[PDB]
Amino acid sequence: NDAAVITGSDTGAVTEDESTPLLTETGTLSVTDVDGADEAKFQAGNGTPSAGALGSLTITEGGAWTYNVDNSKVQYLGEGETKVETFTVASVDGTTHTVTITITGVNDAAVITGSDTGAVTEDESNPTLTETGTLSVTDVDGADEAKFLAGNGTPSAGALGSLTITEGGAWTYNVDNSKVQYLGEGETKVETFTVASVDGTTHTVTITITGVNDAAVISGSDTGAVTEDESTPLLTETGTLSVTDVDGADEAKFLAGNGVASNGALGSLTITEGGAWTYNVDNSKVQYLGEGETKVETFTVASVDGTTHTVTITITGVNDAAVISGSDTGAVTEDETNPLLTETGTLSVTDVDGADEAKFLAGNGTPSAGALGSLTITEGGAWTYNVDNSKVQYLGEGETKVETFTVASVDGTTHTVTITITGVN
Ligand SMILES: [Ca+2]
Ligand SMILES: [Ca+2]
Ligand SMILES: [Ca+2]
Ligand SMILES: [Ca+2]
Ligand SMILES: [Ca+2]
Ligand SMILES: [Ca+2]
Ligand SMILES: [Ca+2]
Ligand SMILES: [Ca+2]
Ligand SMILES: [Ca+2]
Ligand SMILES: [Ca+2]
Ligand SMILES: [Ca+2]
Ligand SMILES: [Ca+2]
Ligand SMILES: [Ca+2]
Ligand SMILES: [Cl-]
Ligand code: NA
């Protein structure tokens, strides 16, 4: 027996996903046999596969071979990855030939799932705000590709924080708490970070930062003073508060209107958006305060976000002169008694500065120049004048001598008692 000569197309190629559901390749082999044309033909049927062939090859008597493989079975091949399969065909005689099929893989996108959102709040921790989560990845091109590229996610424009992921998919977002202070209550900033699997398939993690209120910082003039009777009918005090607010210029101003007064305040205070305050009180309401006596009134004002500050006003009293009345005159007549001529009367005092000032300094009245007599007064206002009858004898019938005595209330207010001495023969 002489071996057939088998020639023609004995190689073929299919690419993953070139067609569906089958990848198919064809070729024709030709056979000549020197033992005659009954031998110069192929055994029709399946070629004998290499071990671990996924595809199959059939050949006709005429040498027309077809390779078929399920596209589903070659998905695991990565971009450019080759699998070579061989099939043995034979002459009617038994002379063998091999057909060589190459399968070439294409990339399959990774499938990325799991936690791809997170949230941090201003001041939840310090100095760093942290969020964590886990992505997971599958990739039909194999365990080699079913992994993240470890490192930083590519940040959105103007992101404050950063995100790192591990090969297993564990991500960590961190932002400096100092950098998010400027966000107001419930205000949000969204930052995104793009991560990648080995084959360059991307997924986004979206992080929402939420702000909390920062208390305004109020400073400037928060104290003021008025003095009774410095002006009328109002006593007025002004000052300017300043405010900053890290939550922004929207918040760095005052709520215009009245300050909330301390209970028992006699005055009132208004403030402008720009922090200019004005305290007013009716002068008539503070008369009752005595010299140097104080009354402190406080007014609560607020910034836009409700941060409060106190303005403290001190009212200082001044003396009101006592009103002195009652019996401030008296009379004695030469020889009416002996050896003293005596006269009594009672003064009264009332004082706007209070019942505490409604009394006299007890003691001697300050005598007029050349006074013969003298006068004492009690704390209650009862006075007593005495003169020696011997010293008034010189006065003629109906001739008078007027003597005056200055007394004082406890606040220093003076009053005169006037005594008339009348002469006889
Ligand atoms: Ca032969
Ligand atoms: Ca593939
Ligand atoms: Ca892949
Ligand atoms: Ca594929
Ligand atoms: Ca969180
Ligand atoms: Ca804030
Ligand atoms: Ca803050
Ligand atoms: Ca604020
Ligand atoms: Ca007064
Ligand atoms: Ca007064
Ligand atoms: Ca007084
Ligand atoms: Ca008083
Ligand atoms: Ca006389
Ligand atoms: Cl597919
Ligand atoms: Na703001």
Author numbering: 22 to 446
What text does the study give?
RTX adhesins are long, multi-domain proteins present on the outer membrane of many Gram-negative bacteria. To expand the reach of the ligand-binding domains, RTX adhesins maintain a central extender region of multiple tandem repeats, which makes up most of the proteins’ large molecular weight. In this study, we analyzed extender regions from two additional RTX adhesins, including the long adhesion proteins from Marinobacter hydrocarbonoclasticus (MhLap) – an oil-eating marine bacterium – and Aeromonas hydrophila (AhLap) – an opportunistic pathogen of fish and mammals. However, all the tetra-tandemers have at least one calcium ion coordinated in the linker region between beta-sandwich domains whose role appears to be the rigidification of the extender region to help the adhesin extend its reach.
The repeats are rotated relative to each other around the long central axis, producing a handedness to the tetra-tandemers reminiscent of helices. Both the MhLap and AhLap structures show right-handed rotations, with pitches of approximately i + 3 and i + 2, respectively. Alternatively, the AhLap repeats possess a more involved connectivity, resulting in 50 Å-long beta sandwiches that are held together by one four-stranded and another five-stranded beta sheet. Each inter-domain interface contains, at minimum, three highly coordinated Ca2+, labelled as calciums I, II, and III. Of the three, calcium I has the fewest coordinate bonds to protein-based ligands, with two positions in its six-ligand octahedral coordination sphere being taken up by water molecules. Both calciums II and III have pentagonal bipyramid coordination spheres, comprised of seven protein-based ligands each. The three Ca2+ are all coordinated by a combination of Asp, Asn, and Glu sidechains that are conserved in every repeat of the full-length adhesin (except the Glu in position 7, which is a comparable Gln for five repeats), as well as backbone carbonyl groups. Of those six, four of them hold an additional calcium. In fact, the AhLap tetra-tandemer appears more rigid than the MhLap, with both angles remaining closer to the start angle over the entirety of the run.
